[PDB]
Amino acid sequence: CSRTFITFSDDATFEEWFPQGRPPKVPVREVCPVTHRPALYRDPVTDIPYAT
């Protein structure tokens, strides 16, 4: 056989770069507080999401 290894013989931090975490993008479709459509915009002055 001809198999391959990569050994991080240095500080394990250099392997620690890669693993753990892997979160989702938590937000989901936001609903506006007026017409209750799913939002298309976020107002710069309130940060409220809105549609129409």
Binding site: P33, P44, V45, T46, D47, I48, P49
Partner: peptide, 27 residues
């Protein structure tokens, strides 16, 4: 549609526009 007539630019040459207020957050 959005042709800017002599009128509208002479209008924006009137008293100045006020500043914004973007700091707040409520959602």
């Amino acid at each position: 549609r959005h042709r800017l007539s002599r009128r509208v630019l002479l209008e924006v040459a009137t008293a100045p526009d006020p500043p914004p207020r973007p700091k707040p957050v409520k959602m």
